[PDB]
Each structure stands twice: as C-alpha cells, then as structure tokens.
Amino acid sequence: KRRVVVTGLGMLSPVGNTVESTWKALLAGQSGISLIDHFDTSAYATKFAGLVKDFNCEDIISRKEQRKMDAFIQYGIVAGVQAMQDSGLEITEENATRIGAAIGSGIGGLGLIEENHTSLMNGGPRKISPFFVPSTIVNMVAGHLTIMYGLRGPSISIATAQTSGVHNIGHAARIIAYGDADVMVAGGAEKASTPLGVGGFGAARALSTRNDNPQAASRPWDKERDGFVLGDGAGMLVLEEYEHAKKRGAKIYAELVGFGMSSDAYHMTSPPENGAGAALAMANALRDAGIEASQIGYVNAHGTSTPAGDKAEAQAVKTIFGEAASRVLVSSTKSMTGHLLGAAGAVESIYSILALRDQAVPPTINLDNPDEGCDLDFVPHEARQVSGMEYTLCNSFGFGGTNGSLIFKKI
Amino acid sequence: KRRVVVTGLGMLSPVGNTVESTWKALLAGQSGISLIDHFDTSAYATKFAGLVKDFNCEDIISRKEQRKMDAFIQYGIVAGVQAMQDSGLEITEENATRIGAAIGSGIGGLGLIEENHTSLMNGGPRKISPFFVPSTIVNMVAGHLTIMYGLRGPSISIATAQTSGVHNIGHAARIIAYGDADVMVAGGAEKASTPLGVGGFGAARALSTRNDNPQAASRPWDKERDGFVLGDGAGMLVLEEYEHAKKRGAKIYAELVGFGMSSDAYHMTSPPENGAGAALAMANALRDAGIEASQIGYVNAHGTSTPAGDKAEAQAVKTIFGEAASRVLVSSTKSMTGHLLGAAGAVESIYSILALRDQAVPPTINLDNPDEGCDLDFVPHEARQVSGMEYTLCNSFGFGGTNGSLIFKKI
Ligand SMILES: C[C@]12C[C@]34C[C@H]1C[C@H](O2)[C@H]3[C@](C)(CCC(=O)Nc1c(O)ccc(C(=O)O)c1O)C(=O)C[C@@H]4c1ccccc1
Ligand SMILES: C[C@]12C[C@]34C[C@H]1C[C@H](O2)[C@H]3[C@](C)(CCC(=O)Nc1c(O)ccc(C(=O)O)c1O)C(=O)C[C@@H]4c1ccccc1
After folding, report:
1. Other C-beta atoms within 10 Å of A67: how many?
2. Where does the chain bind platencin (chains A, B)?
3. Phi/psi at B225 (5° precision)
4. Chain-centre distance of CA A311, in angstroms?
5. Ligand 1 centroid vs A348 CA: distance in angstroms?
C-alpha cells in the first residue's frame, strides 16, 4: 500500500510569482485582477483579467527556446522548475525511469494559435510556423520538463477543461500508488487572456462584465455576482511515494489521501441545481481517503462567481456535510485570483496544502451580500485562523460536467 | 484483483464507417487516402489525407446539437454510440455512478477554431460563437457521451498528442481496476485535416508530399518514405470489469492485460535513434501483464512513415524482442489508414483486438523496399494468417517524447 506525499511546490499566479508570495497575498485578501492592456479591449464586453505580472524566464528558457512555446507552456515550465528545485530531488540514471509528469491545461496555446492563424489568413500556409503544433498543444509542458530534467517515467496530460488541475494531480498520485512511478511533477498551466479566450467565454455569457471595478468583479456567492473572471498562471506539485521521500530526507508538505471523480451528465456548460455531481465527486474522495465529511476543516471551493455554479456547489457541500456543514470552512480564492481554468485546481491544491501547514484559511473577498437561505461559512472578507485542522478538500468542476475532488492530510 | 475486458467497439476511419467494414478493408490492403477537396490546397505542400467518407450523424445528433460541435466531437460521439450499442449494456439508476469515460484527442477542434478566429478577424469579437469553447475543447466528446447515456462515473480526457488513444484506454482500465468504475467507454477522436492541421504539420516538414500518388505515400519502413499521412476518425472501446461483464452475459472481445508508459526526454518532435523510450514503454507493458516478449505474436506498430520515427521503433522492437524479434509479426495499419493522431492508438487497439479474434494480421502496404540491416517481419503487402496467437501489443508515441503501449490477451 503505497502512500503519496507532496515534497515540492511551484507557482505563478495573478497575485505572486512564487508559492510563498502568492500565499501571503491571498491571506492578506489581495486581488490580482486588472484591466487588460496587451490587446485592444474596446469591442470586448469584459476588459479585465488576472494577469501574471512581470513574468521572467530569461534564466530558465533561452529567448531561442521561447520562440517555440506559447505563454502557457513558458508558465508551466517555470512553475515546474520551481517545484523540482523546491523538492531537492536529484535525477540519476537509476532514478530517471521512475520519475514522470502529469501536467495539463484546459485550452492550451490560444496566443500562438491566433498568431499562426492570423499569419495563414494574411500570407497563406507558408507563413505558418514550423513550431505551430509543438508550441500550442496541451501536453507540451510535460514534454519540455521531462526533457529538461531527463525524466523517463510515465508522462500524461489531462485536458478536462476547468477540472484539469485536480485530475492531473489525482492521476499522478494513482500512477505512483499503482507502482508505475515513485515521483511525478503534476499540475496545470493556462494563459487564456487572449482575444479568443476573453471573446469566447464572453460570447457564452459566462464572464463578469464589471469593467468599472475589476477587483470587485469576482465575488463568489455574492448576490451581485455576474460571471467568472479569467486568471492566468500555473501550479505544480512534486508528488512522491512516502518511503522514497523519507529515505532521501525530503521535506514533506502534506499527504494526498483521497481523489474522487464524477460526471454531471446534465448540460455541457452548467451544473444541475442539485449539485449532485459535485456531491458525488466529494463523496468519492472521502471514501477513497477513508474518512467522514466531518473530518474536513476547510474546502477550497471551485466557486467561480457564476450565478448557477456557486449555488450548485453550495447545495453539494450542504448535502455531503449535512450537520457539520456549519462547522466546515469553505472559501473561494478565485475571488482574488480569478479563474485559472486548467491550472485552477493545481494552484488551489497548493492553497489547500498551505492551509494545513499554516493553520490559516484565505477568505472569499467581495462577499458583501451572500445568497439567502444558505447557512455555510464562506469565510467572507478576512482570513481565518483554524485550530487542529487535519484535512482539507479541493474541488474543481468543468464544462462537459466533469468533476474532481482531492483530499490532503496534515503530515 | 480486478480484470478488465473489452465488451464493445465503435469506429470511424478512412477505410470504413463501422468496426467490421474497417477491419475487412484493412485485411484486404485497401488505402483510405485521397486528395483533399474541402479546402483549396493549391498553396499546400501536402494535398491529400485519410478522410472519413460520407459521415452520417443525422439520426444520432440533431443538426441543432451539431451546430455546437466541431467535426472531431461529432466523430467521437458516433463512434462512442456504436461502442455503447455494441456492448449491450443497459444504464440504470443503480449503475450510472459506476460507468464513466476516458476520451481524448491530440489537437481537438481545429475546424471551429479556424471558423471562430476568421469570424473575429472579419467582424470583431461579437462574431465569435457562444459555442466556441465547448465546441472545440478536447474533453467535449466525453462530455456529450456522459450526458447522452446518463453516465455519472469518472470522466477524464487525456491529450498526449499522438499517444492519446493508448493513454485514454490504459487509464480507463486503471480506473476500473482501482475500483473507481465498472465500465468505461474509452478512446480518441480527431479531425485535423484542416488548413492549420495540414499547414501546421507541413511547416514542421513532417508530412509526406507525394501528391502524385496519395495512396502510395504512407509507406512505413520503406526507403522512399518521406513523412506521415494525416488521417481522420475515432476509435472507441467499452472496457469493463470481468465479473461485471460475465454477470450480464456480455460478449467479450478480449482482455486488457498490460499498459506501459515512458518518456523519451530527448527532443520535442523526434525520438532518439536508440528508440529507448519506445522500448521502455513496451518493457513496462510486458511487466504489467506479467509476460515475456516472446509471448506476443503481433505488434501493431506506431509506424508513421517518417524517416527517423520508423527507424527508432524498429530498434526498440529489436531491443525488447531480442531473439524472438524474427518470430514476432509487426505491421503498421497507418500504411492504409494514415495517422489518426489522438485517435490512432484507439483505432489501432481495436485492430490489435480483432487480430486476436480472427487470427489474422493486416499488412504494412507500400513496403516495396525496406530499410537495410533490419531482420524484422513487417508483414509487407498482404495479410498473414497466424496460428495460436494469445497476445497482441499496440504502440503509440507522441510529440513531447510521450509513449504508451497496451497488451491485449485472447479471451
Ligand atoms: C448555457 C449557459 C447558461 C448560463 C449562461 C450560459 C453559460 C452557462 O451555461 C451558464 C452560467 C453563465 C454558468 C454556469 C456554470 O457555472 N457553468 C460551469 C460548469 O458547469 C463547470 C465549470 C465551470 C467553470 O467556470 O469552471 C462553469 O462556469 C450561469 O450561471 C447561468 C447562465 C444562464 C443565463 C440565463 C438563463 C439561464 C442560465
Ligand atoms: C525537428 C524535426 C526533424 C525531422 C523534421 C522535423 C520534424 C521531426 O522533428 C523530424 C521527422 C520529420 C519526424 C521525426 C518523428 O518521427 N517524430 C515523432 C515523434 O517523435 C513522436 C510521434 C510522432 C507521430 O507522427 O506520431 C512523430 O512523427 C524526421 O523523420 C526527421 C526530420 C529531419 C529532417 C532533416 C534533418 C534531420 C531530421
């Protein structure tokens, strides 16, 4: 029976370019949302997003290799290097074969897709870059990291839209627990703040259009919420078999004890009022970890700030938590960070792990006036200290009705 | 210890719109390659591909739901309905929660990506379809099928480029074997025969440009080969826990006994001369199934028809097979079908299963003059009868150096 622990963290987010700076900003209630200035937003209903500030990879990726990568890949590689360095793991000929990666994205390389298509429209196919395919496809972050570190173990990339982060991390764990690997770098990366991303989620009526107050736009469970806020970034964890971790004297952030999956089988872009899929995913993670809902002290919600989605998850938590629903803390960091899509569940799993280490839960900012009829504690406005918290639960849900939940355990 | 069997098959390919018609064409050595006529190829170095002929979904998808889906999704849904019907499984309230899907794609919705981007360039973001995101993203085939059949179990989508088919099928099996599900519809779908797909793989110098003889273009291991041939389609299998299958009187095509993964950690778009990654993936599948290379009677190769790729896999087979290398049969159906990318490993896993049922192996057509120095039997030109074949092995490799191998066992 192989246990899986977390021994390395890496991250780029709209509120910090490292794991610790991001976590600190979150506990301080800082918003990373701002007006977009990299493309003309005049014709766009939504003109703001959670952008990665002053992104720097000069020292990690040549400007030469950079030409072959969409920004999402650059972000994922930087976050993965952060996590690999953080873990302190040394790759050897003996080891190589037992270390792999499970890294995905929800939409992949929109920026270079648009650049190559513009080139084709303007000058014909001869203007398409030789790097079109490898610079835009989802699995390219795992591709570059394995090459960079000489990892020859299993490499997969799960693209389950907004649930990708959670699924890649959960399957990395399954892979290790099954015996196919002893270490996996896992998570997700996304850079969808482009004309097609903003225009596309906007065409669907899914984004907040509160342009006059971008930082107040993301407000999960608030009565005035009007859609999600796009966020860019990457989150990466180094997962590792327990005995392997101890043997090398690794620092252990927490243990990954449960992973649950489910499907809504309801609608392509909306959950059922019931939240029955979200509930099933949580129920499965609890069963997988062998614990009762009452043992969870904090739920890092999917909480995207949409009218129907927030309501469904609140119903799901009430259903799974029952009596303890008032005792469990629930918050949505998307209130500050925006929605990282395929990387959401990866950065949020990190927040869930840090909550265990620091015994402190970040708030749902902007929660001025919560929906009526709900007795859940969404940790409005300010961080909250916790006492003897042993388990946290991270949810991620996605278009296509695909859901996932992870459960982390202290020590 | 839960065993996984295959109880349903579905498929659309350039040589047939059903599983049986496709298999028959393959055993007859028929090419499905033709000149492209749906877009003007004047400026294109490659002007042919393996197209799905007379695709029909009128009776499976309304022309209304169709408007919300890229062709790859339409293909995957039709193949998945074929597999679900073939399995004879009945979905109940009791069952729903235990049936899921693992379906992916390598590039996803290129056609609608291009249509929406053209619309944005011509008329601004207001012209982007509300269906842009859900009509192009990778996980949408699993999304629609779960909704269509009321499946509430685990749903994932692996996007590992040209290895997707094999990885989705292997992880569907892991999911069932772990206990997270009793049935999974799994496979891949692709429709990359578009300006960006043909122009994009063409910019990379990876496609054959033998326009004067499209049907002779795909010629794995042949001295005159000059790159892969793009193919469109979908392959889907219904995987199911053994006891669950027997209990309902399911028809069982074969058993899935081994799944191996590996990474080349070499180059983003080319394997090492050594084929050491391909070898490791095969070695891992053999270990997973608990058998020796000598027990395999047929290898459905990745064999894409590129100068470097074919050579590497031939080296890998020689390495893993050793003495038995001359005794094992190896063929590449891409010689006829073209390269289905994310769906390649899914359709090829089907070919691998049918080879067991019929005791017949399809040929590598166009193999007029094999590379020198290789003593492998690539089954040139004509199908071959086999005698007491108990195991087949299917390989799929992809950009990013990601590899996978599956092993199927008779009965
Ligand atoms: C067809 C509609 C209905 C519509 C507008 C479009 C878009 C969406 O479907 C829906 C939204 C905006 C979003 C529902 C939702 O939360 N989907 C969802 C999800 O299922 C999984 C993950 C995520 C994520 O962001 O990771 C996510 O957003 C809503 O609130 C009600 C509203 C709506 C408007 C007017 C009348 C009725 C309903
Ligand atoms: C940088 C280059 C080198 C180049 C041209 C570009 C494209 C590619 O890389 C390579 C090709 C065309 C393809 C190598 C390959 O098989 N990649 C591959 C793979 O790693 C996994 C899966 C698949 C699949 O199709 O599923 C696949 O194609 C070759 O043969 C030699 C040739 C080349 C030309 C001139 C000099 C040296 C080399």
Report:
1. 12
2. 269, 306-308, 339
3. -60, 145
4. 21
5. 21
For residues B408 and B406, what is the distance between their CA atoms, to the nearest angstrom?
7
- The CA angle B226-B227-B229, to the nearest 5 degrees, is 125
3-state secondary structure string across chain B: CCCEEEEEEEEEECCECCHHHHHHHHHCCCCCEEECCCCCCCCCCCCEEECCCCCCCCCCCCHHHHCCCCHHHHHHHHHHHHHHHHHCCCCCCCCHHHEEEEEECCCCCHHHHHHHHHHHHHHCHHHCCCCHHHHHCCCHHHHHHHHHHCCCCCEECECCHHHHHHHHHHHHHHHHHHCCCCEEEEEEEECCCCHHHHHHHHHCCCECCCCCCHHHHCCCCECCCCCECEECEEEEEEEEEHHHHHHCCCCCCEEEEEEEEEECCCCCCCCCCCCHHHHHHHHHHHHHHCCCHHHEEEEECCCCCCHHHHHHHHHHHHHHHHHHHHCCEEECCHHHHCECHHHHHHHHHHHHHHHHHHCEECCECCCCCECCCCCCECCECCCEECCCCCEEEEEEEECCCEEEEEEEECC
The experimental technique used to determine this model is: X-ray
SS3 A256: strand
Token pair for A132 = 């079109």
Across the A:B interface, residue pairs with CB atoms under 8 Å apart total: 275
Q: How far is A40 from chain B (nearest CA, A)?
A: 11
What is the residue whose two structure tokens read 């259009």? A209
Element (H, E) at A115: helix A110-123
Q: Which ligand is nearest to the CA of B161?
A: 2
3-state SS, residue A312: helix
A290: helix, strand or coil: coil
- Read off the amino acid at residue B175: I
Query: Separation of B267 CA from ligand 2 center, angstroms?
Result: 10
Measured CA to CA, the distance from residue B127 to residue A21 in angstroms comes to 40
State the burial class of residue A194 (Cβ atoms within 10 Å of its Cβ: 0-12, 13-18, 19+). Answer: buried
Cα–Cα separations (whole angstroms), residue B25 to A399, B22, B190, B345: 38, 5, 20, 18
Distance from CA of A155 to the nearest CA of B (A): 6
C-alpha–C-alpha distance, residues A289 and B216, integer Å: 55
Instruction: Determine whether the interchain pair B399/A161 forms a contact, defined as Cβ–Cβ distance below 8 Å.
Output: no
Which domains, from first to last, does chain B contain? 5-258 (3.40.47.10), 259-411 (3.40.47.10)
- Residues paired with residue A380 on neighbouring β-strands, in sequence order: A364
Give ∠ CA A131-A133-A138 in degrees, rounded to 5. 125
Mutate to test the pocket of ligand 1, among A270, A274, A334 (most ligand atoms within 8 A of CB): A270
Nearest residue to A36 via CA among A44, A47, A26: A47
Place of tokens 């200290």: A385
Please check whether residue A188 is in contact with residue A168, taking contact to mean a CB–CB distance below 8 angstroms. Answer: yes
What is the number of other CB atoms lying within 10 angstroms of the CB of residue B251? 12
Side-chain half-sphere CA neighbours of B174 within 13 A: 26
User: Nearest to residue B411, comparing CAs of B186, B187, B244, B257?
Assistant: B257
Place of tokens 């270390």: A99
Nearest-CA residue for atom 12 of ligand 2:
B206
Which token pair is A405? Answer: 């939940």
